[PDB]
C-alpha atoms as an extended CHARMM CRD file, in Angstrom:
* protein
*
        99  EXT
         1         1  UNK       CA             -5.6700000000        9.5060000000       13.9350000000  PROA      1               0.0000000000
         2         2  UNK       CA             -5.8350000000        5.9320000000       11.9330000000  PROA      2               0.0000000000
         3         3  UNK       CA             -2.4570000000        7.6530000000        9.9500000000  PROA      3               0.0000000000
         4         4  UNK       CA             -2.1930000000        9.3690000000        6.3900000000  PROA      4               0.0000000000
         5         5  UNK       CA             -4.2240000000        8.0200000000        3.5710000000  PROA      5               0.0000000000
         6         6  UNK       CA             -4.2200000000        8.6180000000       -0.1570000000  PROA      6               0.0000000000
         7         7  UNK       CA             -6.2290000000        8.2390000000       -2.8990000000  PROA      7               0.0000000000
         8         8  UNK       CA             -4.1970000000        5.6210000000       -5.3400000000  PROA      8               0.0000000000
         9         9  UNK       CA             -5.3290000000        3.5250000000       -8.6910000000  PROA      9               0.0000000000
        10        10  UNK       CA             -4.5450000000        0.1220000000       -8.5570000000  PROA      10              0.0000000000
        11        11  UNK       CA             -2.4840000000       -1.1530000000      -11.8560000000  PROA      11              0.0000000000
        12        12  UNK       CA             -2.0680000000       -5.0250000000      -13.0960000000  PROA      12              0.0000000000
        13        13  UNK       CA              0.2010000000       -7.1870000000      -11.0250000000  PROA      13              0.0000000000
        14        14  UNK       CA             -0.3670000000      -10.8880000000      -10.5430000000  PROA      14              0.0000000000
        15        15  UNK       CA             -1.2300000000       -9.8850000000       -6.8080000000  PROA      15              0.0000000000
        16        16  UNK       CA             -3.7240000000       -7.0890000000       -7.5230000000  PROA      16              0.0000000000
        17        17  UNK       CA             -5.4210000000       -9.5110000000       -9.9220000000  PROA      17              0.0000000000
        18        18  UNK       CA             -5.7920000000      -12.5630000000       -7.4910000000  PROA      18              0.0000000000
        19        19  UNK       CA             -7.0160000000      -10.1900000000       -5.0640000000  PROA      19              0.0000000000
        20        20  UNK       CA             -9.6590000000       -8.5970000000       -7.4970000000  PROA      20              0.0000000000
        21        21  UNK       CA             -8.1970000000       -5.3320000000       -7.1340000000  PROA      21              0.0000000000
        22        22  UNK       CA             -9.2820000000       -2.8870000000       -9.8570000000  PROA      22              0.0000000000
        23        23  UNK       CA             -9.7450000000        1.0230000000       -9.9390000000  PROA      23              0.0000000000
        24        24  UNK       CA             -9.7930000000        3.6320000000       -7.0740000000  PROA      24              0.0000000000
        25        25  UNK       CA             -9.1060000000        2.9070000000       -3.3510000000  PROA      25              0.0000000000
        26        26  UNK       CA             -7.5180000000        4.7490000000       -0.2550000000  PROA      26              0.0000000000
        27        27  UNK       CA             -4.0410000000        3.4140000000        1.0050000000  PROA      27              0.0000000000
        28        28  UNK       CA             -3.3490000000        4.5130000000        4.3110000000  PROA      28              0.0000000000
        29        29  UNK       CA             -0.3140000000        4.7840000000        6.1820000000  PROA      29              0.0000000000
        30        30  UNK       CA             -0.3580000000        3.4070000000        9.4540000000  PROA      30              0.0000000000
        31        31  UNK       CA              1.5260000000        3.2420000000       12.3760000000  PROA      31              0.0000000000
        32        32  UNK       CA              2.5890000000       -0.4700000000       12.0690000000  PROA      32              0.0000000000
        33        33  UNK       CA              1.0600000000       -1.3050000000        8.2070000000  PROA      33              0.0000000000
        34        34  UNK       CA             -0.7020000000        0.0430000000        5.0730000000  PROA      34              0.0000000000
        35        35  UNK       CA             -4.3000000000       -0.6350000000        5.0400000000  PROA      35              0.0000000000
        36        36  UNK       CA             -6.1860000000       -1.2580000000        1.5780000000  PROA      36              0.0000000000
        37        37  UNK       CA             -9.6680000000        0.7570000000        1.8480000000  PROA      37              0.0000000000
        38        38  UNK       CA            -12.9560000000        1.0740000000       -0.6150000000  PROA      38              0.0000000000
        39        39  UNK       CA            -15.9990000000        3.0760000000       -0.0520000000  PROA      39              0.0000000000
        40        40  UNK       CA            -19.2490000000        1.0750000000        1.1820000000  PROA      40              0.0000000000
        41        41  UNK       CA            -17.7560000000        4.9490000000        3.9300000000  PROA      41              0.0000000000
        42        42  UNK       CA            -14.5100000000        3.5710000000        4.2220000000  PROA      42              0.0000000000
        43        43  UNK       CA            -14.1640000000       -0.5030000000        4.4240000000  PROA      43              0.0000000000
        44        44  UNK       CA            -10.9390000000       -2.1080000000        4.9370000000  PROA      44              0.0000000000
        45        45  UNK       CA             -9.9720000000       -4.6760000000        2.2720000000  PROA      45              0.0000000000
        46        46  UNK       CA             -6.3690000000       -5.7200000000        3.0600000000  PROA      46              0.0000000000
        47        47  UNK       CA             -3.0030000000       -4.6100000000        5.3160000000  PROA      47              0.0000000000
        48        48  UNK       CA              0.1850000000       -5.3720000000        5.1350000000  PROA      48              0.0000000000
        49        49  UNK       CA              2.4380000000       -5.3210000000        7.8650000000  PROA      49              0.0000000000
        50        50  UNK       CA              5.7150000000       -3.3880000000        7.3340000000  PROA      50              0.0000000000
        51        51  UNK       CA              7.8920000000       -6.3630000000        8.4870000000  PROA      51              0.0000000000
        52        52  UNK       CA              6.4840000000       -8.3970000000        5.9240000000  PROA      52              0.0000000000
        53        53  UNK       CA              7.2540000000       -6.0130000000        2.9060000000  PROA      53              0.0000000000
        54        54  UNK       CA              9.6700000000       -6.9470000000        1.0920000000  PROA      54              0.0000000000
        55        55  UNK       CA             10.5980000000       -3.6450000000       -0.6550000000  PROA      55              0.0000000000
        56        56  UNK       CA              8.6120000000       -0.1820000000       -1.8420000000  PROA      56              0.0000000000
        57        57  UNK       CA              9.6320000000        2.5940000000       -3.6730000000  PROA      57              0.0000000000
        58        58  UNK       CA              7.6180000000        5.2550000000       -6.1040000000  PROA      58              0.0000000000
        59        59  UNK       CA              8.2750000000        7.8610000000       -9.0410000000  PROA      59              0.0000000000
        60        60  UNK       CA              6.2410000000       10.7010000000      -10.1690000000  PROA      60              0.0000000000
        61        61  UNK       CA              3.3460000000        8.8200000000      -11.5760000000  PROA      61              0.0000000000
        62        62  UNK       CA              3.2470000000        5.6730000000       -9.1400000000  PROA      62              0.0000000000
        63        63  UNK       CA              3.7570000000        3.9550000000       -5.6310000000  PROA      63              0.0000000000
        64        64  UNK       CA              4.5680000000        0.5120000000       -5.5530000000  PROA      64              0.0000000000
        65        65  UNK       CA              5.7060000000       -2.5300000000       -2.5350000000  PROA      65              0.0000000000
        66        66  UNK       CA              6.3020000000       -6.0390000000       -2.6440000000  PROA      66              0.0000000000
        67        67  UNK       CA              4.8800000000       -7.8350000000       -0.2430000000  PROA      67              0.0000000000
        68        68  UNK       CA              6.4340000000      -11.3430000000        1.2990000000  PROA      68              0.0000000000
        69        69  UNK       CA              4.2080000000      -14.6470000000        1.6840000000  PROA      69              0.0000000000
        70        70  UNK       CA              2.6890000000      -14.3930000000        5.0840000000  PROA      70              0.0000000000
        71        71  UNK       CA              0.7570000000      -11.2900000000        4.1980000000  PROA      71              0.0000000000
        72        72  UNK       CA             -3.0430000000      -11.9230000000        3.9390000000  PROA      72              0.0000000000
        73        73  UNK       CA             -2.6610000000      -11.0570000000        0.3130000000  PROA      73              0.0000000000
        74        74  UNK       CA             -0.0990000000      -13.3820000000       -0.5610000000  PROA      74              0.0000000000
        75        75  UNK       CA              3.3910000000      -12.3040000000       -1.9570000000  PROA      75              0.0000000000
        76        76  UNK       CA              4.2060000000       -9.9600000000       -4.8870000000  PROA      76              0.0000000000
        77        77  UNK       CA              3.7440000000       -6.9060000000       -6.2120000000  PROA      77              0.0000000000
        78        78  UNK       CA              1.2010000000       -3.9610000000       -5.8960000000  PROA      78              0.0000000000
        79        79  UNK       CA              1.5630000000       -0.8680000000       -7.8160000000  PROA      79              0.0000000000
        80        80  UNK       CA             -0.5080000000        2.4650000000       -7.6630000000  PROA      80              0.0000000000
        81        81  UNK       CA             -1.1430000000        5.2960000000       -9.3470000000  PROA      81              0.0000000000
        82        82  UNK       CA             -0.7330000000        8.3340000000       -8.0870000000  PROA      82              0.0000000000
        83        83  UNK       CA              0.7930000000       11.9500000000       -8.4150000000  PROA      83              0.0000000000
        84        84  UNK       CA              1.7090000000       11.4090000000       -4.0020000000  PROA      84              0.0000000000
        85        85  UNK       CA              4.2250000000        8.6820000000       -4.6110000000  PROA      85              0.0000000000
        86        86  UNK       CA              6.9410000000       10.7320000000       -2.5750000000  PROA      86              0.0000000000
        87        87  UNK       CA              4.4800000000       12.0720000000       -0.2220000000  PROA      87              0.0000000000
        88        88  UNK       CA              3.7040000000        8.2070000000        0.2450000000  PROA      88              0.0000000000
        89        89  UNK       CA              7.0180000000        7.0010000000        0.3410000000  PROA      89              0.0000000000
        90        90  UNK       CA              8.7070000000        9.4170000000        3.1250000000  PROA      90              0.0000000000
        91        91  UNK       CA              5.3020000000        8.3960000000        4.9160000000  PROA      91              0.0000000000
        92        92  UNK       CA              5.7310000000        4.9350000000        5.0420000000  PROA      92              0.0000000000
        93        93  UNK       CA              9.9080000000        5.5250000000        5.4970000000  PROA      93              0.0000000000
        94        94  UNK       CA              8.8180000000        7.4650000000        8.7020000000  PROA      94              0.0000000000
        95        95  UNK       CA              6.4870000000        4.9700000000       10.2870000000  PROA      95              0.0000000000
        96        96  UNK       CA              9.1500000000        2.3780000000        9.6120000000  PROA      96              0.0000000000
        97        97  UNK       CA             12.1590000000        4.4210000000       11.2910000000  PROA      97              0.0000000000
        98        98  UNK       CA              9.5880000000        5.1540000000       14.2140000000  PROA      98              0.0000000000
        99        99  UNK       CA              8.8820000000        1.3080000000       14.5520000000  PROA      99              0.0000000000
């Protein structure tokens, strides 16, 4: 019911770094945002609104956005591991085109 969620691996990006993000975490696919989550359970960290992305897009080994500068994360880049990039990406195209 919170929306589809993924397990992803964070890689370096100036954003990821200044927001101390390293290893394994859940992104989940909401109805209006993504949602950053760790285990304590699952604790949210950071969202990001869909109208404040700038861009996203994936391949076969990664998911990846860019988020704009009134996102509680700042701007720029955060890229993710992950063999679900396309299951992520029609996801996230979905919830957009339903907004």
């Amino acid at each position: 019911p919170l929306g589809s969620q993924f397990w992803v691996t964070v890689q370096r990006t100036e954003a990821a770094e200044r927001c101390g993000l390293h290893g394994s975490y859940v992104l989940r696919v909401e109805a209006e945002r993504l949602t950053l989550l760790t285990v304590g359970i699952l604790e949210p960290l950071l969202s990001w609104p869909y109208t404040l992305l700038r861009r996203y897009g994936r391949d076969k080994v990664m998911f990846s956005f860019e988020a704009g500068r009134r996102c509680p994360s700042g701007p720029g880049t955060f890229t993710f591991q992950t063999a679900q990039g396309n299951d992520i990406f029609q996801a996230v195209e979905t919830a957009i085109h339903r907004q």
